[PDB]
Protein backbone atom coordinates (compact mmCIF):
# COMPACT_ATOMS: atom_id res chain seq x y z
CA UNK A 1 0.00 0.00 0.00
CA UNK A 2 3.04 2.29 1.22
CA UNK A 3 6.69 1.79 0.03
CA UNK A 4 8.58 4.04 1.72
CA UNK A 5 7.13 8.07 0.79
CA UNK A 6 5.13 6.53 -1.82
CA UNK A 7 1.29 5.49 -2.00
CA UNK A 8 0.76 2.46 -4.41
CA UNK A 9 -1.92 3.23 -7.25
CA UNK A 10 -2.90 1.30 -10.57
CA UNK A 11 -0.16 -1.43 -11.85
CA UNK A 12 1.02 0.33 -15.00
CA UNK A 13 2.31 -3.38 -15.84
CA UNK A 14 3.61 -6.76 -14.81
CA UNK A 15 6.22 -8.05 -16.54
CA UNK A 16 9.67 -10.16 -16.30
CA UNK A 17 10.69 -10.50 -12.55
CA UNK A 18 9.58 -6.96 -11.96
CA UNK A 19 6.03 -5.16 -11.60
CA UNK A 20 5.89 -1.27 -12.67
CA UNK A 21 3.29 0.11 -10.32
CA UNK A 22 1.64 3.82 -10.47
CA UNK A 23 2.26 5.51 -7.28
CA UNK A 24 2.08 8.95 -6.28
CA UNK A 25 4.93 10.98 -3.93
CA UNK A 26 3.34 11.40 -0.25
CA UNK A 27 5.06 14.89 0.18
CA UNK A 28 5.67 16.33 -3.33
CA UNK A 29 2.07 14.95 -4.81
CA UNK A 30 3.69 13.86 -7.34
CA UNK A 31 2.56 11.07 -10.24
CA UNK A 32 5.96 8.48 -10.33
CA UNK A 33 6.34 5.05 -11.87
CA UNK A 34 8.47 1.98 -9.31
CA UNK A 35 9.58 -0.75 -10.84
CA UNK A 36 8.94 -3.36 -7.81
CA UNK A 37 11.89 -6.07 -8.08
CA UNK A 38 12.36 -8.90 -5.24
CA UNK A 39 16.35 -9.89 -5.46
CA UNK A 40 15.47 -12.93 -3.90
CA UNK A 41 13.72 -14.54 -7.58
CA UNK A 42 15.64 -13.16 -9.82
CA UNK A 43 19.10 -15.47 -11.50
CA UNK A 44 22.68 -13.59 -11.01
CA UNK A 45 22.97 -12.59 -14.74
CA UNK A 46 18.87 -10.95 -14.41
CA UNK A 47 20.18 -9.14 -11.03
CA UNK A 48 23.54 -7.39 -12.47
CA UNK A 49 21.65 -6.94 -15.78
CA UNK A 50 19.11 -4.76 -13.82
CA UNK A 51 21.87 -2.85 -11.54
CA UNK A 52 23.65 -2.01 -14.73
CA UNK A 53 20.52 -0.10 -16.24
CA UNK A 54 20.41 1.66 -13.04
CA UNK A 55 23.48 3.43 -13.77
CA UNK A 56 22.84 3.81 -17.30
CA UNK A 57 20.05 5.70 -16.20
CA UNK A 58 22.06 7.75 -13.98
CA UNK A 59 23.99 8.96 -17.04
CA UNK A 60 20.77 9.55 -19.13
CA UNK A 61 19.09 12.76 -17.80
CA UNK A 62 17.18 14.40 -21.05
CA UNK A 63 13.99 16.05 -21.81
CA UNK A 64 12.69 13.21 -23.94
CA UNK A 65 14.16 10.06 -21.81
CA UNK A 66 12.27 8.92 -18.77
CA UNK A 67 14.51 10.32 -15.28
CA UNK A 68 14.78 8.08 -12.80
CA UNK A 69 14.47 10.00 -9.49
CA UNK A 70 15.24 7.59 -6.52
CA UNK A 71 16.60 4.37 -5.94
CA UNK A 72 15.16 2.40 -2.75
CA UNK A 73 17.04 -0.88 -1.66
CA UNK A 74 16.42 -3.64 1.61
CA UNK A 75 18.10 -6.64 1.77
CA UNK A 76 15.64 -8.75 -0.55
CA UNK A 77 14.18 -5.57 -2.50
CA UNK A 78 14.68 -3.00 -5.28
CA UNK A 79 12.25 0.16 -5.81
CA UNK A 80 12.54 1.82 -9.08
CA UNK A 81 11.20 5.70 -8.65
CA UNK A 82 11.08 6.85 -12.07
CA UNK A 83 8.82 10.27 -14.26
CA UNK A 84 5.50 8.49 -15.21
CA UNK A 85 4.12 8.87 -18.38
CA UNK A 86 0.33 10.20 -18.90
CA UNK A 87 0.02 9.54 -22.68
CA UNK A 88 0.74 5.87 -22.72
CA UNK A 89 2.74 4.53 -25.40
CA UNK A 90 3.20 5.44 -28.70
CA UNK A 91 1.96 2.04 -30.01
CA UNK A 92 -1.52 2.64 -28.09
CA UNK A 93 -1.92 6.13 -29.83
CA UNK A 94 -1.49 4.92 -33.43
CA UNK A 95 -3.85 2.07 -32.78
CA UNK A 96 -6.57 4.73 -31.59
CA UNK A 97 -5.94 7.09 -34.05
CA UNK A 98 -4.07 5.86 -36.52
CA UNK A 99 -0.97 7.26 -38.67
CA UNK A 100 0.23 10.95 -37.85
CA UNK A 101 0.37 13.78 -40.35
CA UNK A 102 4.12 14.47 -41.50
CA UNK A 103 3.92 17.69 -39.52
CA UNK A 104 3.24 15.61 -36.25
CA UNK A 105 5.30 12.77 -37.17
CA UNK A 106 8.47 15.29 -37.80
CA UNK A 107 7.36 16.88 -34.53
CA UNK A 108 7.65 13.42 -32.30
CA UNK A 109 10.54 12.12 -34.52
CA UNK A 110 12.92 15.02 -33.70
CA UNK A 111 12.25 14.40 -30.25
CA UNK A 112 12.97 10.74 -30.65
CA UNK A 113 16.30 11.76 -32.78
CA UNK A 114 17.43 14.40 -29.88
CA UNK A 115 17.12 11.43 -27.34
CA UNK A 116 19.37 8.44 -29.39
CA UNK A 117 21.36 11.85 -30.33
CA UNK A 118 22.38 12.18 -26.81
CA UNK A 119 22.33 8.15 -25.63
CA UNK A 120 25.35 8.05 -28.49
CA UNK A 121 27.29 11.09 -26.97
CA UNK A 122 27.93 9.11 -24.24
CA UNK A 123 28.74 6.16 -25.97
CA UNK A 124 25.33 4.20 -24.94
CA UNK A 125 22.89 2.38 -27.40
CA UNK A 126 19.41 1.33 -26.43
CA UNK A 127 18.90 -0.96 -28.58
CA UNK A 128 15.21 -1.67 -27.94
CA UNK A 129 13.67 1.05 -29.74
CA UNK A 130 9.85 0.01 -29.89
CA UNK A 131 7.05 2.04 -30.43
CA UNK A 132 5.56 0.43 -26.97
CA UNK A 133 9.16 1.81 -25.82
CA UNK A 134 8.39 5.34 -27.31
CA UNK A 135 6.38 6.66 -23.89
CA UNK A 136 3.95 10.10 -24.20
CA UNK A 137 3.96 12.62 -21.00
CA UNK A 138 0.93 15.14 -21.02
CA UNK A 139 0.99 16.97 -23.81
CA UNK A 140 2.02 14.48 -26.18
CA UNK A 141 5.91 14.86 -25.53
CA UNK A 142 8.27 11.22 -26.54
CA UNK A 143 9.61 9.95 -23.60
CA UNK A 144 12.19 7.08 -23.89
CA UNK A 145 11.86 4.22 -21.76
CA UNK A 146 13.33 0.45 -21.28
CA UNK A 147 16.80 0.71 -21.26
CA UNK A 148 16.67 -3.34 -20.38
CA UNK A 149 18.90 -4.00 -23.72
CA UNK A 150 21.45 -0.77 -23.48
CA UNK A 151 24.55 -0.86 -23.02
CA UNK A 152 27.80 0.93 -23.50
CA UNK A 153 29.72 0.83 -27.14
CA UNK A 154 33.11 2.43 -28.54
CA UNK A 155 32.42 4.19 -32.07
CA UNK A 156 34.39 2.25 -34.67
CA UNK A 157 34.12 -1.65 -32.89
CA UNK A 158 31.30 -4.03 -32.95
CA UNK A 159 28.63 -5.31 -30.58
CA UNK A 160 28.03 -9.04 -30.60
CA UNK A 161 24.73 -9.30 -27.80
CA UNK A 162 21.87 -9.89 -29.68
CA UNK A 163 18.66 -8.11 -28.05
CA UNK A 164 15.72 -6.31 -29.49
CA UNK A 165 12.20 -6.94 -30.62
CA UNK A 166 11.86 -8.56 -34.02
CA UNK A 167 9.84 -6.07 -36.30
CA UNK A 168 12.13 -3.48 -35.09
CA UNK A 169 15.60 -5.55 -35.05
CA UNK A 170 18.04 -4.59 -37.95
CA UNK A 171 19.05 -7.68 -40.45
CA UNK A 172 22.09 -7.97 -38.81
CA UNK A 173 20.28 -9.25 -35.18
CA UNK A 174 18.47 -11.15 -37.11
CA UNK A 175 21.57 -13.37 -39.13
CA UNK A 176 23.57 -13.17 -35.81
CA UNK A 177 26.15 -11.05 -37.03
CA UNK A 178 28.65 -8.99 -35.13
CA UNK A 179 26.76 -4.99 -35.74
CA UNK A 180 27.87 -2.07 -35.42
CA UNK A 181 26.12 0.07 -31.99
CA UNK A 182 24.35 3.24 -33.44
CA UNK A 183 23.70 1.20 -36.52
CA UNK A 184 21.19 -0.71 -35.49
CA UNK A 185 19.43 2.17 -33.62
CA UNK A 186 19.26 3.72 -36.77
CA UNK A 187 17.40 1.20 -38.76
CA UNK A 188 15.12 0.95 -35.72
CA UNK A 189 14.51 4.74 -36.56
CA UNK A 190 13.55 3.77 -39.77
CA UNK A 191 11.02 1.38 -38.46
CA UNK A 192 9.74 3.86 -36.25
CA UNK A 193 9.53 6.73 -38.66
CA UNK A 194 7.42 4.44 -41.01
CA UNK A 195 5.19 3.27 -38.11
CA UNK A 196 4.42 6.40 -37.26
CA UNK A 197 3.73 8.21 -41.01
CA UNK A 198 1.71 4.75 -42.02
CA UNK A 199 0.52 3.20 -38.91
CA UNK A 200 1.66 0.10 -39.77
CA UNK A 201 5.39 -1.93 -39.75
CA UNK A 202 7.30 -1.41 -42.69
CA UNK A 203 7.95 -5.41 -41.90
CA UNK A 204 4.99 -7.79 -40.93
CA UNK A 205 3.98 -11.26 -40.92
CA UNK A 206 2.01 -13.86 -39.88
CA UNK A 207 4.73 -15.43 -37.53
CA UNK A 208 8.44 -14.36 -36.22
CA UNK A 209 9.97 -16.48 -39.04
CA UNK A 210 8.23 -14.79 -41.88
CA UNK A 211 8.64 -11.40 -40.60
CA UNK A 212 12.20 -12.47 -40.62
CA UNK A 213 12.28 -13.39 -43.96
CA UNK A 214 10.94 -9.62 -43.83
CA UNK A 215 13.33 -7.65 -42.54
CA UNK A 216 16.02 -9.49 -44.29
CA UNK A 217 14.45 -8.92 -47.70
CA UNK A 218 15.01 -5.22 -47.29
CA UNK A 219 11.81 -4.59 -49.41
CA UNK A 220 8.89 -2.42 -47.95
CA UNK A 221 6.04 -0.10 -49.57
CA UNK A 222 6.30 3.35 -50.12
CA UNK A 223 2.69 4.54 -49.73
CA UNK A 224 0.65 7.44 -51.81
CA UNK A 225 0.50 9.60 -48.39
CA UNK A 226 4.29 9.56 -47.71
CA UNK A 227 6.10 12.43 -49.04
CA UNK A 228 9.31 12.02 -51.59
CA UNK A 229 11.25 13.87 -48.66
CA UNK A 230 10.02 11.36 -46.01
CA UNK A 231 10.24 8.42 -49.27
CA UNK A 232 14.25 9.01 -48.99
CA UNK A 233 14.87 9.72 -45.69
CA UNK A 234 12.80 5.90 -44.46
CA UNK A 235 15.00 4.39 -47.44
CA UNK A 236 18.21 5.78 -46.46
CA UNK A 237 17.95 4.38 -43.26
CA UNK A 238 16.19 1.16 -43.67
CA UNK A 239 19.58 -0.24 -45.50
CA UNK A 240 20.59 -3.65 -45.80
CA UNK A 241 24.17 -2.57 -45.84
CA UNK A 242 24.97 -0.81 -42.23
CA UNK A 243 28.15 0.99 -43.60
CA UNK A 244 25.54 2.90 -46.21
CA UNK A 245 22.85 3.86 -43.49
CA UNK A 246 22.97 8.23 -42.80
CA UNK A 247 24.45 8.53 -39.23
CA UNK A 248 22.49 10.34 -36.49
CA UNK A 249 24.05 13.89 -37.94
CA UNK A 250 22.99 13.14 -41.75
CA UNK A 251 19.13 12.28 -39.92
CA UNK A 252 19.12 15.82 -38.49
CA UNK A 253 20.68 17.47 -41.61
CA UNK A 254 18.26 15.66 -43.75
CA UNK A 255 15.37 17.55 -46.41
CA UNK A 256 12.65 16.23 -44.68
CA UNK A 257 13.75 17.49 -41.27
CA UNK A 258 14.14 20.81 -42.23
CA UNK A 259 10.62 21.38 -44.14
CA UNK A 260 8.21 22.65 -41.60
CA UNK A 261 8.90 25.62 -39.83
CA UNK A 262 12.11 26.80 -38.30
CA UNK A 263 12.44 24.77 -35.23
CA UNK A 264 15.24 26.33 -32.92
CA UNK A 265 14.94 24.11 -29.78
CA UNK A 266 15.75 20.94 -31.80
CA UNK A 267 18.91 22.11 -33.21
CA UNK A 268 20.03 23.92 -29.63
CA UNK A 269 18.86 20.40 -27.75
CA UNK A 270 21.28 18.57 -30.79
CA UNK A 271 23.82 21.16 -30.54
CA UNK A 272 23.81 20.12 -26.52
CA UNK A 273 25.09 16.85 -27.44
CA UNK A 274 28.46 18.07 -29.40
CA UNK A 275 29.28 19.97 -26.45
CA UNK A 276 27.72 17.66 -23.44
CA UNK A 277 29.56 19.82 -19.83
CA UNK A 278 21.43 25.98 -11.05
CA UNK A 279 20.22 25.86 -7.87
CA UNK A 280 16.12 26.43 -8.01
CA UNK A 281 15.97 28.81 -4.52
CA UNK A 282 12.09 28.74 -4.81
CA UNK A 283 12.43 24.47 -4.36
CA UNK A 284 15.31 25.00 -1.73
CA UNK A 285 13.29 26.94 0.35
CA UNK A 286 10.04 24.89 0.38
CA UNK A 287 12.27 21.90 0.79
CA UNK A 288 13.68 24.04 4.11
CA UNK A 289 9.93 25.00 5.66
CA UNK A 290 8.99 21.22 6.05
CA UNK A 291 13.16 20.36 7.04
CA UNK A 292 14.84 18.95 4.70
CA UNK A 293 18.57 20.57 5.14
CA UNK A 294 20.30 22.65 2.71
CA UNK A 295 23.68 20.90 3.33
CA UNK A 296 22.28 17.16 2.82
CA UNK A 297 19.68 18.66 0.15
CA UNK A 298 23.59 19.52 -1.98
CA UNK A 299 25.10 16.66 -0.77
CA UNK A 300 23.01 14.28 -2.14
CA UNK A 301 22.49 16.17 -5.29
CA UNK A 302 26.36 15.99 -6.53
CA UNK A 303 26.91 12.35 -5.19
CA UNK A 304 24.08 10.99 -7.27
CA UNK A 305 22.62 9.79 -4.12
CA UNK A 306 18.63 9.11 -5.60
CA UNK A 307 17.61 9.60 -1.89
CA UNK A 308 14.77 10.89 -0.48
CA UNK A 309 16.50 14.64 -0.40
CA UNK A 310 17.83 14.10 -4.12
CA UNK A 311 14.17 12.82 -5.42
CA UNK A 312 11.95 15.78 -3.37
CA UNK A 313 13.84 17.91 -5.03
CA UNK A 314 13.91 16.77 -8.77
CA UNK A 315 9.80 16.00 -8.15
CA UNK A 316 9.73 19.31 -7.22
CA UNK A 317 11.37 20.89 -10.09
CA UNK A 318 9.52 19.05 -12.30
CA UNK B 1 -24.53 -13.21 -26.95
CA UNK B 2 -21.77 -12.05 -28.54
CA UNK B 3 -22.57 -9.50 -31.64
CA UNK B 4 -20.48 -7.27 -33.63
CA UNK B 5 -22.95 -3.62 -33.71
CA UNK B 6 -22.54 -1.48 -37.20
CA UNK B 7 -22.90 2.42 -37.95
CA UNK B 8 -25.70 3.35 -40.30
CA UNK B 9 -26.02 3.40 -44.27
CA UNK B 10 -24.28 6.38 -45.22
CA UNK B 11 -24.36 8.26 -49.09
CA UNK B 12 -21.07 10.31 -49.94
CA UNK B 13 -19.77 12.30 -52.58
CA UNK B 14 -16.95 11.58 -54.36
CA UNK B 15 -13.80 12.78 -52.80
CA UNK B 16 -15.32 12.73 -49.26
CA UNK B 17 -14.61 10.30 -46.52
CA UNK B 18 -16.61 7.63 -44.88
CA UNK B 19 -15.78 6.61 -40.95
CA UNK B 20 -17.97 3.05 -39.74
CA UNK B 21 -17.73 1.80 -35.87
CA UNK B 22 -17.76 -2.03 -35.33
CA UNK B 23 -18.99 -2.18 -31.22
CA UNK B 24 -19.06 -5.48 -29.20
CA UNK B 25 -21.18 -6.42 -26.97
CA UNK B 26 -21.27 -9.46 -24.46
CA UNK B 27 -17.32 -10.02 -24.64
CA UNK B 28 -14.76 -8.45 -23.28
CA UNK B 29 -11.64 -7.37 -24.48
CA UNK B 30 -9.41 -8.35 -26.85
CA UNK B 31 -10.67 -9.13 -30.02
CA UNK B 32 -8.52 -8.80 -33.92
CA UNK B 33 -11.52 -7.25 -35.72
CA UNK B 34 -10.70 -6.96 -39.51
CA UNK B 35 -12.61 -4.77 -42.38
CA UNK B 36 -14.15 -7.05 -45.35
CA UNK B 37 -16.18 -4.88 -48.24
CA UNK B 38 -18.67 -6.92 -50.88
CA UNK B 39 -19.54 -4.47 -53.82
CA UNK B 40 -22.96 -4.87 -55.52
CA UNK B 41 -22.39 -8.82 -56.80
CA UNK B 42 -19.33 -9.26 -56.54
CA UNK B 43 -17.24 -11.52 -54.07
CA UNK B 44 -15.71 -10.47 -50.55
CA UNK B 45 -12.28 -9.19 -50.57
CA UNK B 46 -10.07 -7.84 -47.35
CA UNK B 47 -8.95 -4.29 -46.41
CA UNK B 48 -7.32 -4.42 -43.47
CA UNK B 49 -7.18 -5.56 -39.85
CA UNK B 50 -5.34 -6.90 -36.99
CA UNK B 51 -3.07 -9.42 -37.62
CA UNK B 52 -0.49 -9.98 -35.76
CA UNK B 53 1.10 -9.08 -32.35
CA UNK B 54 3.82 -7.28 -33.86
CA UNK B 55 2.19 -4.11 -35.60
CA UNK B 56 -0.32 -1.63 -34.66
CA UNK B 57 -2.67 -2.39 -37.60
CA UNK B 58 -2.09 -4.30 -41.36
CA UNK B 59 -3.70 -3.12 -44.40
CA UNK B 60 -4.10 -5.14 -47.93
CA UNK B 61 -1.75 -3.47 -50.87
CA UNK B 62 -4.48 -1.77 -52.11
CA UNK B 63 -6.49 0.07 -49.22
CA UNK B 64 -3.22 1.12 -47.42
CA UNK B 65 -3.22 4.80 -49.10
CA UNK B 66 -6.81 5.60 -48.15
CA UNK B 67 -7.55 3.11 -45.47
CA UNK B 68 -7.38 4.02 -41.60
CA UNK B 69 -8.32 1.39 -38.83
CA UNK B 70 -8.25 2.34 -35.58
CA UNK B 71 -10.24 1.36 -32.36
CA UNK B 72 -11.25 2.63 -28.88
CA UNK B 73 -10.11 -0.16 -26.57
CA UNK B 74 -12.17 2.18 -23.29
CA UNK B 75 -15.61 1.08 -25.06
CA UNK B 76 -14.99 -1.58 -27.21
CA UNK B 77 -15.29 0.00 -30.83
CA UNK B 78 -12.94 -0.69 -33.55
CA UNK B 79 -13.33 1.76 -36.34
CA UNK B 80 -12.40 1.84 -40.29
CA UNK B 81 -11.74 4.90 -42.36
CA UNK B 82 -12.03 5.19 -45.85
CA UNK B 83 -10.79 8.48 -47.99
CA UNK B 84 -10.50 9.80 -51.27
CA UNK B 85 -13.93 8.27 -51.88
CA UNK B 86 -14.98 7.11 -55.46
CA UNK B 87 -18.32 5.24 -57.53
CA UNK B 88 -15.83 1.97 -57.15
CA UNK B 89 -16.06 2.30 -53.05
CA UNK B 90 -19.64 1.45 -53.08
CA UNK B 91 -20.25 -1.65 -51.07
CA UNK B 92 -21.12 -3.51 -48.20
CA UNK B 93 -18.73 -3.12 -45.07
CA UNK B 94 -18.24 -5.56 -42.67
CA UNK B 95 -16.39 -5.86 -39.70
CA UNK B 96 -14.94 -9.46 -38.34
CA UNK B 97 -13.45 -11.04 -35.66
CA UNK B 98 -10.32 -13.76 -35.95
CA UNK B 99 -11.26 -16.77 -33.99
CA UNK B 100 -7.71 -17.70 -32.16
CA UNK B 101 -6.71 -14.53 -31.10
CA UNK B 102 -6.86 -16.47 -27.62
CA UNK B 103 -3.82 -18.36 -29.01
CA UNK B 104 -1.81 -15.33 -30.82
CA UNK B 105 1.94 -15.42 -29.58
CA UNK B 106 4.62 -15.05 -32.14
CA UNK B 107 4.73 -18.61 -33.60
CA UNK B 108 1.44 -19.91 -33.29
CA UNK B 109 0.41 -19.03 -37.11
CA UNK B 110 -3.24 -18.11 -37.15
CA UNK B 111 -6.10 -19.60 -39.33
CA UNK B 112 -7.19 -15.97 -39.74
CA UNK B 113 -10.87 -17.42 -39.83
CA UNK B 114 -13.86 -15.36 -39.17
CA UNK B 115 -15.73 -16.34 -36.03
CA UNK B 116 -18.05 -13.29 -35.58
CA UNK B 117 -19.48 -11.07 -38.60
CA UNK B 118 -21.05 -7.58 -38.52
CA UNK B 119 -24.50 -7.07 -40.16
CA UNK B 120 -22.78 -4.50 -42.75
CA UNK B 121 -22.60 -1.33 -43.55
CA UNK B 122 -24.45 0.65 -47.19
CA UNK B 123 -21.62 2.74 -48.02
CA UNK B 124 -22.92 4.50 -51.22
CA UNK B 125 -20.49 6.81 -52.97
CA UNK B 126 -22.52 9.05 -56.04
CA UNK B 127 -21.51 9.04 -59.40
CA UNK B 128 -7.21 -14.12 -56.08
CA UNK B 129 -8.11 -17.70 -55.10
CA UNK B 130 -9.32 -19.20 -58.01
CA UNK B 131 -12.83 -21.09 -57.50
CA UNK B 132 -15.52 -22.62 -59.75
CA UNK B 133 -17.97 -19.38 -60.27
CA UNK B 134 -21.23 -21.67 -59.90
CA UNK B 135 -21.92 -25.28 -59.08
CA UNK B 136 -25.16 -27.25 -59.08
CA UNK B 137 -26.94 -30.17 -57.84
CA UNK B 138 -30.14 -31.91 -57.21
CA UNK B 139 -31.49 -32.62 -53.46
CA UNK B 140 -29.55 -35.36 -52.09
CA UNK B 141 -26.36 -35.20 -54.43
CA UNK B 142 -22.95 -34.38 -53.50
CA UNK B 143 -21.36 -31.21 -55.08
CA UNK B 144 -17.86 -30.14 -54.67
CA UNK B 145 -16.14 -26.61 -54.66
CA UNK B 146 -12.84 -26.58 -55.83
CA UNK B 147 -10.44 -23.91 -54.42
CA UNK B 148 -6.74 -23.01 -56.29
CA UNK B 149 -4.19 -20.67 -54.16
CA UNK B 150 -0.57 -20.70 -54.52
CA UNK B 151 2.15 -21.89 -51.77
CA UNK B 152 2.31 -18.89 -50.87
CA UNK B 153 -1.22 -18.73 -49.37
CA UNK B 154 -2.87 -22.56 -49.71
CA UNK B 155 0.01 -24.46 -49.79
CA UNK B 156 2.14 -22.17 -46.63
CA UNK B 157 -1.58 -21.67 -44.50
CA UNK B 158 -4.77 -23.24 -43.49
CA UNK B 159 -7.92 -22.97 -45.55
CA UNK B 160 -11.58 -21.43 -44.21
CA UNK B 161 -15.10 -21.80 -45.89
CA UNK B 162 -17.92 -19.40 -45.51
CA UNK B 163 -21.19 -19.57 -46.20
CA UNK B 164 -23.35 -16.37 -47.72
CA UNK B 165 -26.63 -16.89 -47.79
CA UNK B 166 -28.92 -14.28 -50.01
CA UNK B 167 -28.48 -10.77 -48.55
CA UNK B 168 -26.62 -11.90 -45.34
CA UNK B 169 -22.94 -11.59 -43.92
CA UNK B 170 -21.02 -14.32 -44.52
CA UNK B 171 -20.65 -16.84 -42.26
CA UNK B 172 -17.85 -19.47 -41.23
CA UNK B 173 -18.50 -22.86 -42.57
CA UNK B 174 -15.45 -24.36 -42.51
CA UNK B 175 -12.19 -23.25 -40.43
CA UNK B 176 -8.56 -25.21 -39.97
CA UNK B 177 -9.28 -26.61 -43.33
CA UNK B 178 -11.88 -29.74 -42.09
CA UNK B 179 -13.03 -28.22 -38.93
CA UNK B 180 -17.17 -27.99 -38.55
CA UNK B 181 -17.95 -25.06 -36.34
CA UNK B 182 -20.61 -25.52 -34.23
CA UNK B 183 -24.66 -25.34 -35.67
CA UNK B 184 -22.90 -26.85 -39.11
CA UNK B 185 -23.94 -30.16 -40.23
CA UNK B 186 -21.72 -33.30 -40.95
CA UNK B 187 -23.08 -32.99 -44.53
CA UNK B 188 -20.36 -30.04 -45.51
CA UNK B 189 -16.40 -31.44 -45.33
CA UNK B 190 -13.50 -29.69 -46.56
CA UNK B 191 -9.87 -31.24 -47.34
CA UNK B 192 -6.34 -29.73 -48.39
CA UNK B 193 -4.07 -30.99 -50.98
CA UNK B 194 -1.05 -29.01 -51.20
CA UNK B 195 -2.22 -25.72 -53.01
CA UNK B 196 -5.63 -26.60 -53.54
CA UNK B 197 -8.70 -27.17 -51.00
CA UNK B 198 -12.20 -29.03 -51.13
CA UNK B 199 -15.41 -28.54 -49.88
CA UNK B 200 -18.24 -31.15 -49.91
CA UNK B 201 -21.84 -30.69 -49.52
CA UNK B 202 -23.33 -34.40 -49.27
CA UNK B 203 -26.99 -34.65 -48.97
CA UNK B 204 -27.93 -31.58 -51.04
CA UNK B 205 -31.05 -29.66 -49.23
CA UNK B 206 -33.11 -26.49 -50.44
CA UNK B 207 -31.53 -24.68 -47.62
CA UNK B 208 -27.90 -25.28 -48.93
CA UNK B 209 -29.00 -22.13 -51.94
CA UNK B 210 -26.61 -19.91 -51.22
CA UNK B 211 -22.70 -18.39 -52.17
CA UNK B 212 -19.57 -20.44 -50.73
CA UNK B 213 -16.16 -18.42 -50.11
CA UNK B 214 -12.81 -20.09 -49.36
CA UNK B 215 -10.31 -18.01 -47.63
CA UNK B 216 -6.40 -18.34 -46.87
CA UNK B 217 -4.11 -16.27 -45.46
CA UNK B 218 -0.85 -15.14 -48.27
CA UNK B 219 2.36 -14.67 -46.92
CA UNK B 220 2.98 -12.22 -49.59
CA UNK B 221 4.78 -9.08 -48.47
CA UNK B 222 3.55 -8.15 -45.33
CA UNK B 223 0.51 -10.66 -45.33
CA UNK B 224 -3.03 -10.33 -46.71
CA UNK B 225 -6.32 -12.72 -46.40
CA UNK B 226 -7.23 -13.99 -49.91
CA UNK B 227 -10.79 -14.98 -50.46
CA UNK B 228 -12.23 -16.69 -53.57
CA UNK B 229 -14.43 -15.27 -56.61
CA UNK B 230 -17.47 -17.49 -55.12
CA UNK B 231 -19.63 -20.21 -55.82
CA UNK B 232 -23.24 -19.90 -56.16
CA UNK B 233 -24.78 -23.07 -55.08
CA UNK B 234 -27.88 -23.81 -56.88
CA UNK B 235 -30.39 -27.18 -56.23
CA UNK B 236 -32.60 -28.37 -58.80
Known amino acids: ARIGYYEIDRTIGKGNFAVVKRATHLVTKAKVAIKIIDKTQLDEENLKKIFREVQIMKMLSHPHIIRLYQVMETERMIYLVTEYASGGEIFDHLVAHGRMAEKEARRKFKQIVTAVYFCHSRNIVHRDLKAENLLLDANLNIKIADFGFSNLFTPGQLLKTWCGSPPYAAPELFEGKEYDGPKVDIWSLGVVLYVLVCGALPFDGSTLQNLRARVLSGKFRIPFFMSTECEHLIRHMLVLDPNKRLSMEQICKHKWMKLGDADPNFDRLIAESQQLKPLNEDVLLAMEDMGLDKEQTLQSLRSDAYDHYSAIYSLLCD | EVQLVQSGAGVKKPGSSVKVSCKSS???????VSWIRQAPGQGVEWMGG????????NYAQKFQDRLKITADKATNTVYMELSGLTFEDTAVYYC?????????????????????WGRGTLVTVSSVLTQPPSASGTPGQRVTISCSGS????????VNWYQQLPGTAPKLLIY???QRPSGVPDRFSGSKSATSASLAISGLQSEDEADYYC????????????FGGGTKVTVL
Open chain 2, 96 to 116: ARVGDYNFWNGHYRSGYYFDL
Open chain 2, 26 to 32: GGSGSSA
Open chain 2, 50 to 57: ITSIFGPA
Open chain 2, 151 to 158: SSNIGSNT
Open chain 2, 176 to 178: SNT
Open chain 2, 215 to 226: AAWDDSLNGHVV
